[PDB]
Amino acid sequence: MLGIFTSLLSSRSFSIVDQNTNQLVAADLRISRVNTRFSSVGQRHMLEDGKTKMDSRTIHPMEIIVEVFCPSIDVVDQINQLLLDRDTLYKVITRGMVFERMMCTSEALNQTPDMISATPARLTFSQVLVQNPKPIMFRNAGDSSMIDRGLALAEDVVGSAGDLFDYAVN
């Protein structure tokens, strides 16, 4: 959609940027369609007289469904480890529409005699709802807010005081 120039005849549309290390991933998918469906639910409340107060609204997580063509086995394995990559969030940039905190919920390959070289694939991501979309951080390494560990039940070791003393001497 409009709103931004390029003056640049080589802009790539789709991008899946890994959040940590801020690197591209699956840089060879042939995207064919993107569908970014939002969701939210009402709290209809009928009340005595013919009437229904909707109360408030809860924002359900965003979902994205991407139909792509994988042209190579390396890309297919990249998508497989995308699905199996449980400890990084991804950022999906479809068309000037940046989406952060996104993880792959589902993925389906299709192998048919209509495409013997490449394989169509349907990926679905879902946003990870977070209490604070924008967090507060600090520059220097001295001044965190303290985190409490609760009751620990200090575990048991045996070294005697002599070993600790020899360690401190060395």
Partner: protein, 188 residues
């Protein structure tokens, strides 16, 4: 359309092996479509966050929470094929009816392993008088977690504790200790 000129590293040959015997099973099973669904499950309720901490000390906490908040569901295949022989179909139905059955489906380039049959549809229609159209479904019993394990030799194996409960008395031609002594003195 010369179909025997298949690729070398992306050969389109479905090879259903058998994890027990490592032999190709159900050959002559001309395949017509293979769909591999690999689902997962992500958090639905908003995750809590603890800000007002530092750069990079929030990062690993979020990474642990994220690695803790997704659950991976097993892989499924849906093979559509055309069986030309009664032997292949009888074997397929027998394998399906067998409770214990793990195979290794290899699509064009996938090596989905530890896979068992969930559903099996055989359709006989007037337009396919010979052969019958088959639609099989497979589910992953166990993802290929790498068993690091203490291998290669009977010793060095970990202790497995079989907690027995009740010992039976005896059988055979045994009369207590004299029976035991005769059996032992037989040197057999």
């Amino acid at each position: 359309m010369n179909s025997f000129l298949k690729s070398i590293l992306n050969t389109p040959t479905l090879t259903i092996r058998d994890d027990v015997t490592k032999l190709p099973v159900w050959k002559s099973l001309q395949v017509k479509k293979v769909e591999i669904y690999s689902p997962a499950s992500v958090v639905s309720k908003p995750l809590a966050t603890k800000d007002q901490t530092e750069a990079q000390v929030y990062t690993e906490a979020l990474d642990i929470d994220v690695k803790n908040g997704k659950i991976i569901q097993p892989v499924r295949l849906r093979i559509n094929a055309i069986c030309p022989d009664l032997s292949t179909v009888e074997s397929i139905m027998n394998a399906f009816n067998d409770n214990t059955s793990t195979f290794a489906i290899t699509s064009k380039s996938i090596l989905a392993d530890k896979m068992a049959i969930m559903t099996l549809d055989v359709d006989q229609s007037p337009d396919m008088l010979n052969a019958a159209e088959i639609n099989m479904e497979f589910e992953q019993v166990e993802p290929p977690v790498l068993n690091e394990f203490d291998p290669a030799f009977p010793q060095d194996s970990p202790t497995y504790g079989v907690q027995i409960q009740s010992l039976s008395d005896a059988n055979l031609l045994d009369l207590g200790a004299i029976g035991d002594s005769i059996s032992s003195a037989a040197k057999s």
